[PDB]
Amino acid sequence: GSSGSSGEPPKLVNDKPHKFKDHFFKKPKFCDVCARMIVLNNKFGLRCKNCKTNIHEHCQSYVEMQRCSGPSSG
Q: Does 25 bind Zn ion (CB under 5 A)?
A: no
Among 14, 34, 41, 61, binds Zn ion (CB under 5 A): 34
Phi-psi category of residue 53: left, alpha or beta, with phi > 0 → left and psi -120 to 50 → alpha? beta
Q: Does 63 bind Zn ion (CB under 5 A)?
A: no
Q: Does 47 bind Zn ion (CB under 5 A)?
A: no
3-class state of residue 41 by DSSP: helix
Q: Does 39 bind Zn ion (CB under 5 A)?
A: no
Site residue total, Zn ion (CB under 5 A): 9
Within 8 A by CB and 6+ apart from 29, the residues are 37, 38, 43, 45, 54
Residues within the interface to Zn ion (CB under 5 A): 18, 31, 34, 48, 50-51, 56, 59, 68
